[PDB]
Amino acid sequence: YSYIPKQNKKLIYEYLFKEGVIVVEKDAKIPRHPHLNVPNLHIMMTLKSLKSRNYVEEKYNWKHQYFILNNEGIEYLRE
Amino acid sequence: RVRTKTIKRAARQIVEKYYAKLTLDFQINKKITEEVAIIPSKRMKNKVAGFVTHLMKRIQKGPVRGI
Amino acid sequence: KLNHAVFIVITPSAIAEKYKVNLSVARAVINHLADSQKLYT
Amino acid sequence: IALTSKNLRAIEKVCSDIMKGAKEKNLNVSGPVRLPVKTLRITTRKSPCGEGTNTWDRFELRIYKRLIDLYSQCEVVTQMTSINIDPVVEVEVIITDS
Amino acid sequence: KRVQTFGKKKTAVAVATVTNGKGLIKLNGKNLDLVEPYILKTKVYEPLWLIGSGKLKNLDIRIRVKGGGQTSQIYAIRQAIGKGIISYYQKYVDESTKKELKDVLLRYDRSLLVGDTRRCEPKKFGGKGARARYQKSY
Amino acid sequence: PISKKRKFINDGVFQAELNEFLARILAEDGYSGVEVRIRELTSLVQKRFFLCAMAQAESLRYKLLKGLAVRRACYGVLRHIMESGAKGCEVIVSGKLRAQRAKSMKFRDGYLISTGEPSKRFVNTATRSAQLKQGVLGIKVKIMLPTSILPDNISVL
Amino acid sequence: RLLEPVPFVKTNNCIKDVDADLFIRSYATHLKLHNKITYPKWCTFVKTGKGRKLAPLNEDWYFIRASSILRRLYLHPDIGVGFLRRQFSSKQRRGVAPNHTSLASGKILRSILQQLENLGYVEQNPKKKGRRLTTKGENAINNFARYINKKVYN
Amino acid sequence: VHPKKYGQGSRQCRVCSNKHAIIRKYNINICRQCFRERADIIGFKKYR
RNA sequence: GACUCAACACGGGGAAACUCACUAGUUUAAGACAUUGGAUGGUGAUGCAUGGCCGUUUUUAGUUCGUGAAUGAUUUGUCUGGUUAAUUCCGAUAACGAACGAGAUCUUAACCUGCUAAUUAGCGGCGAGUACACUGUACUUGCUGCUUCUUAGAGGAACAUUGUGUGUCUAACACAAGGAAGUUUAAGGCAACAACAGGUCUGUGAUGUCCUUAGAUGAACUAGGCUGCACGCGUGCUACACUGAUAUAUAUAACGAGUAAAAUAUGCUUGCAUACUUUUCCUCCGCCGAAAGGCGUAGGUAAUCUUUAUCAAUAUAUAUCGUGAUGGGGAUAGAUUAUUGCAAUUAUUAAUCUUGAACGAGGAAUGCCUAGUAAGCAUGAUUCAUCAGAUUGUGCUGACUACGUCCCUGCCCUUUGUACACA
C-alpha cells in the first residue's frame, strides 16, 4: 500500500516553496527529517519525479542530495 | 662521510669574499660563516663551516686551487 | 629411574650423592644434623 | 582563560598577545601554564587490495592546550580575544579574584 | 640548607633532596637495605664508601622512587644521589673536597655522574622483534 | 557537552564535507575566499548543519573535456603557469588516449624537486579525473611555489 | 645472611624500617598465638586466586594474607580490595593459549577486611574512601614494629 | 524488518556507503578505504 | 580474489540473525518520465578497457638535458684510477655546463639555556600532631617563597672537534681525549627515469563496454556455510622440564583509551498507545557469590575519575617435590555456574571439578639476526554487542660474537661472444 496522501504532497510542495533549499538525504529508513515532521520515505520519489520532470536540479553527494529550486518550477507547482 | 657538490661550491663561493675575516680557529670560523651565509639548516651549516675550517688549514703550506 | 630411600661438607647435592638419597630427605637430614637454595653457612 | 588548537605557531602568537595585554592592563595574572602535549596515534595499511607486501603507516595528530588566569572584567578580555583571535583556535574563559 | 637534584636513565626517574640533619637517608619510607636484592644493594653502597661515612652523617637525604625497572630505578637513584652530593659540596659544605671527589668519581666510573642514552627503539614493521622479520616461505 | 578530541574530529569531517562541496560547486571561478550565490550557499550550509593549482587544473580539465587537442591544451596551460610565475610545472595524463593500450606522457621543465619534507612543503599537488567515451582520464598537476628559502640554494654576495 | 650492615642513621619509628617478608611472618605468628581472627572455616576449600588454580600448600596462607593486607594498607594510605587483587595478581596459564595476568579472589580479601573491621584495626569514612588504619591500629603496629625491631637488633 | 542498533547492521560508512572495514576509533565512523585519501584533507598529517 | 621472492594471521577476512558476492525459501514495489512505451540499481563479467592507489625491479644509484665533438641505429659527457651512505667527490680527461635520484631536510630520545612559568604537577614553609629520636622521621588536614625537579614555548649544543697517523698529501678514513651525542648519534617518512600487460571495476552514485530487472543479478525477512574432512602445504601458541613444575612477599612503566536508548505509571486487556532523568564508556566504593557477574552510588566529554605516589612478567627469597612421560605437558570429553548477544545448538566467552593424548629437543631442508638490537618476558591500541593464539605500538630482562667478503645466492658496472629482442 503506502499510498501517498494529497495533504502530504501539498505540504511538502509548500515547504519547498517557502524554504527554497532542501536537503533530501539518500537514506530512506530514517523515520523522520530534523526540519520536516514527515516520514522521509515519502520524499525521495517525488524529488526524483520533479528532477526527471526537469523542474528542479540536484548536485548530489554521498549520503547527501542538496536540491535547490530552479526558476521554472514554482510557477508550475504552485497549484 | 665526504660531502656534495653543494658544499664544494659553497666553500668555493665563500672565503674569496671575506677571507680576512676568517681565521685559523674552527669555532670562530663557524661563527663567521653563520652570518656570512644565509642557509637556514643548522646541521649542514655546521658541516660547511667545518669544511671552511679544513680548507683554511690547507692554506699557507702550498697551492690550494682556488681563492 | 629413582631408587633412593630415607632409612640409613653438608651441602645438599654432595650429601645426596654420598648417601644415595633424594635431596628433599637430604635437606631433612641436614636439618637433623644441624639441630630455596641458600649460601653455605 | 585556556586555549586549544593544533598548530603551535598560532597558539604561540596568541599567548604572546595574552601576556602583552596582561602586562599593559596590570592585572592579577597568573604565570604561563604549559600543559604536556598529547599525540593522537592511528594505524593504517596501504594496498587497498590484499595483494603485495602489506605495509602500514602511522598517523599522529598533536594537540596544543595552554592556560592562564586574569583578574579583570570579562567583556574587555573577550573583546580583545575576539579582535585578536583566529577562527581555528578555541578559548574558554575562567576568572580569578586573588 | 637544602638542595634538589634529578637523575634519569632509561624510563625511570629519580629525585634527590639533600638536607642537613643527623644521617637520615631514607628511600621514601623503606630503608636503603630492605630493597631485597643485595646485588643491587652493592651498587647502592658503592658511592658511600668512596666518599666516607662522616660526611653523610651530617646530611639527611630524602629519596623518592616512582616506578621503573629494577636496574633502571637503582641507576637513576645513583645518578640523583651523585648530582645531589656534587651540588651540596659546591653549595654548602666544602668546595676543596668537591674537586677531589669529582676527580675520584670520574677516575672510577663515568655512568655514576651522567647516565646512558640507550632506550627502547620503536620496533619497526616486518617482524615481532624490533629488528626481526616474520619467517618467509616459498 | 562534547570532548575536545571528538569535537575536533567532527570539525574535521565537517571541513571535509566543505572541501568536497567546494570542489563540486566551485567551477566557474578560482579561489575567491571562504565563508565561516553566496546567499544560497550559506542557507544550504546552515540547513545541513542545524597561480592556484586547483584553478589551473580545472582550466586544463575543461580544455580536455571539451575535446580540444590534448597536446595544445597542455602546452597552453604550461605557458599559463610559467607566465603566472612558477619555475616549472609537471602535467601527467593517463588513460585511453586514442588507443586501448594505456599510456602516459611526461613534461619536464623547471626545478622539479620530487622528494623530501622541504619538497612537500614547497610543492603542492592537484589530481583529478574526467569522463570520456571509453572510460576515465586521470590528470596530475604539480607546481612548485617559488621559494621561506630553499635550503639547497646557496649564494653569498 | 638476613642481617646486613647499615651505614646510614635509622629511625625504627614504624614498620617501614623493617623487611616486609620477615615482619609479615612475625605478625602472622603473633596473630596465630593471639587467636584474634578465625581461620576462617569457609575458606579452606578455596584457592588463593583463579590464576593460581590450585592449593597454596602452605597451611598459613590466610594468616600471611592478614599480615600483608595491613602492611600494604600502611604503605598506601587509601586503597581497596581491587588494589589488593592487582598487587597479588598471578598467572593464568590457559593451557595452549599464552600466559596472562589474573587478579586474586576478592571475597577472601573482603572477609579479611570484615575481620579487621571487627577487630577495630580499620575504619571507614565518607572522606578518604580507600581503606585506612585507625589511630589505635597505627599505635599498635608502631609498638609491634619497634618491638620486633629491637628483637632483630639484639 | 528488524532494525537493531547493535552489531554489523547497526551502522554504515558515511562516504563509501559500505560498512565493511569501518574503523570506529574516535567515533569517526568513516571507512578506511576512503580514509586513505581523506587523511590529508581531514588535516591529519602523515609524518613517520 | 590472490599462487617464487613479489599470495597461503592477506584482502585490516578474529563470518551465530540481512549481514555475505553462496544455498534452500518468502515477500515489496521502492519501474523515475509521457494499459502501453520507457529508465535506476547491481558484491554480475571484463585489472588483458581503465583512473587512482599499492607491491616489485628498488632503499639501490641510476636517469636526463643544452651546446660541442665522433651515411646510421648511436657514442661522448654519464670516465683509467683513489674514497664513500651513493656518478659521492678528487683526479686524467672531446668534452664544457646543468636537472632529477642520492643528498639534504624533521618527530623521538639524548645535554644546556638555575631561560619560561604553574593548571590538573613538584620542590618548600607552618597550625595540629599520630609514636619515636633528642639540646626530624612514615603519615595526614589548610594556605602560600619558588618552578632544574611532572611537563614543553623556543633556541643552542655535535662540526672528524682537537691532536698522533694512513692518502696521488687533494677527495678520505684510524687511535686517544673533552664531550650525552665520533658507523650522519641512531629508528623512522618522503623514492627519480621507466616498466610489469603484477593486484584491486567486491571501495566508492570513479569508471567504458557486455549482461539482469518483477518469478530482480534491486531491496527486505527465516534458516544454513564460509568453522564439515581420506589427506597435503604456509604464519603462529604450549610444551618436551631441575638454569625445572607449585605456593607465599617485597621493588615496579609508557603509548594508551574512555558518557537515537532504561525503567516507571495511566487506559485498553503480561503486550500496545501515551508522558517524566537519561539507563546507551571506563568506573572507585559497600556488599551479594571462590569466581563469573550483579545490586545503589563517588568521579570524569577527561594529567582531576578508571589510573598511573602505579597496571605486567621474566626475576627476587623461602618453602612441596626433586628429572621417574612424573606432580612436567595440557590435546580430549564429561559435569556446571555467570556475563555478551530477541538468538552461544557447530558446546561464543567463562570461575570450578573431573578427564591425562602426543611430546626425551625433531631427517632431507629452511627463516631472522650486529646493540636496549638477537633471544626471552610481559603490556596498550586496531577491528568489539562478545571473542587475539593476528597486526601494530609500549616496557622489562640486556646475550655468543663479528666490524669483512664474494665461496653460496641476489643485484651493479666494465670487457667479450651471440644465429636471443614477447630478449
TrEMBL record, chain A:
Subcellular location, principal: cytoplasm
GO molecular function list: RNA binding; structural constituent of ribosome
GO CC annotations, alphabetized: cytosolic small ribosomal subunit
Keywords (A to Z) from UniProt: Cytoplasm, Ribonucleoprotein, Ribosomal protein
Gene Ontology biological process terms from the UniProt entry: translation
Domain named Plectin/eS10 N-terminal: residues: 4-79
Annotated localization: Cytoplasm
Similarity comment: family membership: Belongs to the eukaryotic ribosomal protein eS10 family.
Entry protein name: 40S ribosomal protein S10, putative
Organism: Plasmodium falciparum (isolate 3D7)
Range within the parent protein: 11 to 89 of 137
UniProtKB/TrEMBL annotation, chain D:
Any one GO molecular-function label of the UniProt entry: structural constituent of ribosome
Transcription regulation found in the keyword field: no
Keywords (A to Z) from UniProt: Ribonucleoprotein, Ribosomal protein
A GO biological-process term: translation
Gene Ontology, cellular component aspect: cytosolic small ribosomal subunit
Residue ranges annotated for the Small ribosomal subunit protein uS10 domain, each copy included: 1-94
Keyword Ribonucleoprotein in annotation: yes
Similarity annotation: Belongs to the universal ribosomal protein uS10 family.
The protein's name: Small ribosomal subunit protein uS10
Residues of the full protein shown: 21 to 118 of 118
UniProtKB/TrEMBL annotation, chain E:
SUPFAM superfamilies from the UniProt entry: Ribosomal protein S5 domain 2-like
BP GO annotations: maturation of SSU-rRNA from tricistronic rRNA transcript (SSU-rRNA, 5.8S rRNA, LSU-rRNA); translation
Keywords: Ribonucleoprotein, Ribosomal protein
GO molecular-function terms, A-Z: RNA binding; structural constituent of ribosome
Gene3D superfamilies reported in the protein's UniProt record: 3.30.230.10
Entry-linked InterPro entries: Ribosomal_Su5_D2-typ_SF (IPR020568), Ribosomal_uS9 (IPR000754), Ribosomal_uS9_CS (IPR020574), Ribsml_uS5_D2-typ_fold_subgr (IPR014721)
This protein's GO CC annotations: cytosolic small ribosomal subunit
Family: Belongs to the universal ribosomal protein uS9 family.
NCBIfam families associated with the record: PRK00474.1
Protein name listed in UniProt: 40S ribosomal protein S16
Natural source organism: Plasmodium falciparum (isolate Dd2)
Lineage: Eukaryota, Sar, Alveolata, Apicomplexa, Aconoidasida
UniProtKB/TrEMBL annotation, chain G:
Keywords linked to the UniProt accession: Ribonucleoprotein, Ribosomal protein
Entry-linked Gene3D superfamilies: Winged helix-like DNA-binding domain superfamily/Winged helix DNA-binding domain
BP GO terms, sorted: ribosomal small subunit assembly; translation
Superkingdom, taxonomy of origin: Eukaryota
GO CC terms, sorted: cytosolic small ribosomal subunit
Pfam families hit by this protein: Ribosomal_S19e
SMART domains reported in the protein's UniProt record: Ribosomal_S19e
Similarity comment: Belongs to the eukaryotic ribosomal protein eS19 family.
Protein name in the entry: 40S ribosomal protein S19
